[PDB]
Design an enzyme around this catalytic site. Structure first.
Site, mmCIF file in Angstrom:
data_model
loop_
_atom_site.group_PDB
_atom_site.id
_atom_site.type_symbol
_atom_site.label_atom_id
_atom_site.label_comp_id
_atom_site.label_asym_id
_atom_site.label_seq_id
_atom_site.Cartn_x
_atom_site.Cartn_y
_atom_site.Cartn_z
ATOM 1 N N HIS A 291 2.246 -76.113 18.066
ATOM 2 C CA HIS A 291 1.087 -75.200 18.179
ATOM 3 C C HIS A 291 0.164 -74.643 18.353
ATOM 4 O O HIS A 291 1.354 -73.211 19.356
ATOM 5 C CB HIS A 291 0.179 -75.779 20.018
ATOM 6 C CG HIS A 291 -0.979 -76.213 20.479
ATOM 7 N ND1 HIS A 291 -1.063 -74.301 20.937
ATOM 8 C CD2 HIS A 291 -1.904 -77.261 20.787
ATOM 9 C CE1 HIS A 291 -2.665 -74.891 21.567
ATOM 10 N NE2 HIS A 291 -2.906 -76.683 21.514
ATOM 11 N N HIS A 334 1.306 -71.950 30.596
ATOM 12 C CA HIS A 334 0.935 -70.700 30.241
ATOM 13 C C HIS A 334 1.306 -69.940 30.786
ATOM 14 O O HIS A 334 0.846 -69.688 31.998
ATOM 15 C CB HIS A 334 0.059 -70.641 29.003
ATOM 16 C CG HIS A 334 -0.436 -69.386 28.425
ATOM 17 N ND1 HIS A 334 -2.146 -69.657 27.553
ATOM 18 C CD2 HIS A 334 0.186 -68.411 27.773
ATOM 19 C CE1 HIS A 334 -2.029 -67.910 27.101
ATOM 20 N NE2 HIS A 334 -0.957 -68.017 27.076
ATOM 21 N N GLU A 340 -9.533 -64.759 31.225
ATOM 22 C CA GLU A 340 -10.390 -65.512 30.751
ATOM 23 C C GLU A 340 -11.303 -66.005 30.998
ATOM 24 O O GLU A 340 -11.090 -66.946 31.996
ATOM 25 C CB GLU A 340 -9.404 -66.512 30.183
ATOM 26 C CG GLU A 340 -7.811 -66.145 29.875
ATOM 27 C CD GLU A 340 -6.588 -67.005 29.729
ATOM 28 O OE1 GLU A 340 -7.344 -68.314 28.948
ATOM 29 O OE2 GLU A 340 -6.204 -67.234 29.018
ATOM 30 N N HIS A 356 -9.716 -67.510 34.632
ATOM 31 C CA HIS A 356 -8.665 -67.389 34.727
ATOM 32 C C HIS A 356 -7.977 -66.275 35.959
ATOM 33 O O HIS A 356 -8.669 -65.361 33.807
ATOM 34 C CB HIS A 356 -7.671 -68.564 34.076
ATOM 35 C CG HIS A 356 -8.509 -69.891 33.777
ATOM 36 N ND1 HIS A 356 -7.999 -70.764 35.250
ATOM 37 C CD2 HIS A 356 -9.185 -70.679 32.983
ATOM 38 C CE1 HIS A 356 -8.481 -72.040 34.572
ATOM 39 N NE2 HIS A 356 -9.263 -71.455 33.286
#
Lengths: 419, 419, 419, 419
Positions: A291, A334, A340, A356
């Site tokens: 990913h 994560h 963010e 976030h």
């Protein structure tokens, strides 16, 4: 009439209003008398002594110079704010439903009046930091423009088209497109309905394209897809005065002048407004397994005063194929250095968002984990019909008073069995 | 017994032969008497004053130091050559069938004896340039090793496994794997059949991983997948002398010593041999439209003396999904600054190759163009069962005498119809 | 009379011959008429557009400009050579006894006539590389000077003082001192006995001080200890002509002029000859344990075209304390990227030397290993009464024809016992 | 049981708990289902697009992801503070006696409860600056951990061992050792007695090793001596909830979760906690004359946003030989750009300290000057039995309210006689 554009991010452009061919001085910038008896005016977007690759300026050949205006007066800042110290720190995720747009029938609100700062970080008085704003408006700007003395605006329409007038020409910017208006540039916006969108402001710095690394010489946001307005002027005297609104150290000021500021007949240089259609993003990602980090979707970035570290990045999540085999395809669990802001052009609906905070854990919910852990994997279309984005920062974005008020897994471990 | 390895490209490693625990000096490099009465020996792979990220050295704790050997004598260079000026320039593409391997029944040939330089560029006497070699052998090296005083070797097996002895330990390298042996490191190779493969040599420089750019912090060749030998020694006296072969300024020399050079009981540092399995390459490419530049498949790169410009890159074309829509999927027509050697591990068969010269046009043949222009596009598997690669250079690779001797569309334009 | 000097490596200096105070133009470089009716002449030692820290030039205010000379004629190159391709590569160590000096009674030989190139590397025709020369002479240069169009000379007297005349003034350079004469600067040398010494020439680059790293702001070769000549002129017509000898692309040429070239009454700038006394080197080394890399003794360094990599370094081994405890104090066994010329100002005697090739093993002999492995360690004086040095290069130094003609341990391992 | 460690500062490491061999995914990071049915979680310590030498991240393969926790709640910050503007500037030196440790019999205090910020500088809200803390505790942390969202901690035990649990494994850190816990990493500390020590926190940046300059490839803090925990997990449900304490923008917050956070079975990457024993520092200093700048004792450094300028350095004064002849050996009289906190692990006793402000004069007292000016110089042991250190900053460290409350030569000139 559909607008025409020049293309090429960072280009040294030359543009003349087609009504006045040869309005650019030939072979020089500073003639004793300019063609058509215009005035020459330089707009510098960088220190004079920057290396060429980062030296930014444009020359404007205009009916009257910008100096022709009355003194600035303080006006109320409404919901434009930069006091990140008003509100106590809180690491918990924040979420917003689609921000409420004022009805024209209740109150006429133009783009400047409907600007609301959601969050930000850094000291605007030291030219360092960023802010995220939401615009909520319903009426075109009439005989007034705006310019930012502090930094650059990346504008992201969500609901409603923006018809933007700049000194360099006009831009029509639709949802799924973005535009940039850089420090000092005057602009005015027409709207066509109840309008909502997002703005990323960065102080003291400009946006750039990311280096491509191994991706090489083509891909992600191709330079040819960045579109720049063609020269357009109006020579328009304004009874009662045209109002120029200036955001200066985070405060708003108003000065009146006799004519519209959009009286540039011809211009050249590499410091201009521009737009970009997100549909053209050439998506790079994994085609075998694993990913890829979401930095691979970066559209634009702006440097911080720490080397290698962006103050902000603009990242999108575009329609694409997903094909990784033997792989957890959704975003991985994560924790990171960034803060963010998530938005959605088309956990929240289009027009809302989430914030976030630095180093707070995130990752898929239990249902997502479940499905993606067990599915039979095959090539699939991802994100068709949608365009989520993120503004991410190396600083810790802090909500404003207005932003706060507007806001709303099991163990499977088998220790004895590796496989 | 399957060999064990340490992992982590660029790591500062520590390794002791398990027969002699604590053979590394504790807390220092240069004890008055080393553990087990070994000798300390530093192998430097960079100038002493390089910045830390590029400063390369290892300490070896060995039964006898490397100085214990007799004087070098000149030996015949066979088909190892660096005289690029022997042969006249020629821009035409060259192609090779799978290079002929000598039969053991006709002539016993070990790896050093079967080294043939195919092409190269630059002045080896100024430590600048690169060479491509083919090894064609059928017998293990017996009581002799090789080391390169000029540069580093990237070895690419094609037919036959290589069991490689180094001072740092052993490596088994199979077709579809690569290994690197860096300047000054002694090595010896066992083989198991008629053996053929390719070698990229770069003078005066080491290989590195490419920066990932927007790909971010993971992807392409992950650092964890680079495997380093664990310490292994033999304390083995050799009747009649063990022979050390040295390539020095492109010439070969031989010196005899009493014992095997592989007498390092423990070692630490960041300058080591390593291997990598190409199956682990995390392939990045387009997942919406368009055709990504082949730099996106870069495994390793080596810098030139011109900034930003590699002297050589090692690029692979691995099994992957192809999914670009509305796109010509095959490689685009192309003219570029590089010269390109193509090989095939598994226009030529595995074990052959081609050389394309600087700025000479290339692109798909008529049949390929045809099919790819008309096919209905859908997600497809590409290159399963194969592994082609390229060694590409910013210099103009010139064939050797041996390499030369071994070597073998319509207009559719509709001016009146855009669509 | 003992000569006086200015000090400060890299300084922008100003110097006037004391007989003509105010011979420098006040507040400018290029007066219509210079003070004392002199001529202004710029000697550039760098491209015009170098950043300030590396931009090198001096202005000379002189009785006659340098252009006043007759055409150059080819003269025999004697033993000055740059053909590194004349002789076959050989990695074995070379050693030289103290080079034989011609007796004045047999043949009068001045410094230029007694120049012998020993070894070197790189292509002088591309301004890239280095050479090591030995001078062997017995008579002062009379009515002739030398200048190097190719690069810079680091001169290291071994036997005999050198009285050096330059356009910038005089320098007396004794054994244990060094001096630098940079590209283009004319100089002439007086000697006082049978004279011998060493020269390191670097092409297309200048010497610099090494950055100190953690050593900080003081130490090794302190900038104040570099001494620069004070302005001195002679206005001296020379019957029959003064001869200017020019080394240009490695070849020697001679041009006659009417007067001595040392007619600079005043000068200013940062491009000058200089000298340094090695006794002033502030020695840095280990004071607890372990053996420091010999880069720590670097006096001067010159960059290669590869970043971080020196083309040459000048390293000394000065009188000092040795105090490391629990440590093998002598130089460690070693294989490295460099090639190394060793000399001795005061395995060879003073005036001889040795050449060690790239990646060839070296280290202590058996007797040295023995003593240093068993001695009871205590603080000791090292190298008092001596001064060995090394010229080390990132290229592979190759001996000349003349240099070639002039040239001349047990296992203790106890596998079962760590301690 | 004595703990085991991995070694090598900056390494890309791989570690699996020995109870679950092969818990790392083979050849990828993001399997559809991880070995042993673990979850993959990336901890990023740098922006995604940093160059490789500074790109920092680790992958954790854990029983439950970190997201599984309840919302954060504000808790009292005790004596953790960052308001440098609370107290008026004062350039006078401050001194502290060994900070008082609370007796367990009076009040149980764990490491987090006993954290007291002494001084600092910079704006934590802009991720810029540093703080120095003292920990004073007497009881192990029970069912709670801490992590720092703002920056990195360099921990320096003075009295009492610390047994530190991290997600990457355990570390035992004794006085004379240091450890680093980087941004975002959760940790918990056991103690064994009344415990005191020092902490240097740097915001928005990591510690690095200093480039060695001329010291070359070995010396000062050797990379092999930095020790990293080996993977260790507990799968431990906690009745009533395990508490995670988060320092976020200088404020403290608490979130409860069901299990211990130390449930990482395997991990790989280059972003980890580490420890270092100061006894291994390979001391470099003068061995002939003069007094070396104390930068030569630098162990770790952290960059500021101004190039070449550290925000902080960690410098030690280790046991060594002093041997400079004809030299004032004690620290020279000095005024400098830095501000300096001095501590003593083993003018103040161990556990106290002093703070010296920017550009304020310092140097030896009269008695020290006297002795060192007249002594007969000979090699001597310096600092045996002691370990003083300094945290020095390019900013002006300002005391906190708590820090303030806790705080406590003749002319010899002979103008007529040079010698």
């Amino acid at each position: 009439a559909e607008l025409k554009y020049i293309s090429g991010f960072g280009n040294e452009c030359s543009s003349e209003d087609p009504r006045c061919p040869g309005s650019l001085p030939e072979g020089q910038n500073n003639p004793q008398v300019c063609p058509y008896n215009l005035y020459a005016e330089q707009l510098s977007g960088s220190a004079f002594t920057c290396p060429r690759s980062t030296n930014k300026r444009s020359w404007l050949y205009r009916i009257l110079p910008s100096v022709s205006h009355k003194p600035f007066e303080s006006i109320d800042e409404g919901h434009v704010t930069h006091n990140w110290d008003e509100v106590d720190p809180d690491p918990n995720q924040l979420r917003w439903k689609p921000f409420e747009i004022p009805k024209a029938s209740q109150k006429k609100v133009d783009f400047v009046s409907g600007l609301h700062t959601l969050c930000g970080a850094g000291d605007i008085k030291s030219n360092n930091g960023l802010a995220i704003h939401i615009f909520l408006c319903n009426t075109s700007m009439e005989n007034r423009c705006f310019y930012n003395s502090d930094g650059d605006f990346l504008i992201v329409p969500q609901k409603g088209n923006l018809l933007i007038y700049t000194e360099f020409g006009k831009m029509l910017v639709q949802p799924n497109e973005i535009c940039v208006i850089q420090r000092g540039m005057r602009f005015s916006i027409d709207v066509f309905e109840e309008t909502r969108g997002y703005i990323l402001e960065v102080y003291g710095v400009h946006f750039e394209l990311p280096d491509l690394g191994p991706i090489g010489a083509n891909g992600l946001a191709n330079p040819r897809d960045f579109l720049i307005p063609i020269a357009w002027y109006e020579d328009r005297q304004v009874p009662g005065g045209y109002t120029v609104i200036n955001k200066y150290q985070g405060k708003l000021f108003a000065a009146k002048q006799d004519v519209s500021p959009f009286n540039v007949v011809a211009w050249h240089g590499n410091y201009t407004p521009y737009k970009y259609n997100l549909k053209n993003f050439m998506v790079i990602n994994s085609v075998a397994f694993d990913h890829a980090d979401p930095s691979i979707f970066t559209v634009l970035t702006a440097k911080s005063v720490r080397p290698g570290v962006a103050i902000a990045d603009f990242v999108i999540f575009p329609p694409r194929w997903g094909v990784a085999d033997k792989t957890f395809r959704p975003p991985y669990y994560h924790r990171n250095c960034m803060s963010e802001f998530m938005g959605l052009i088309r956990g929240f609906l289009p027009g809302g968002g989430s914030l976030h905070s630095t180093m707070t854990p995130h990752g898929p919910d239990a249902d997502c984990f479940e499905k993606a852990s067990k599915v039979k994997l095959a090539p699939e279309r991802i994100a068709d019909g949608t365009m989520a984005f993120m503004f991410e920062s190396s600083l810790s974005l802090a909500v404003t008073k207005w932003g706060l008020k507007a806001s709303r897994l099991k163990s499977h471990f088998t220790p004895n069995s590796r496989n």
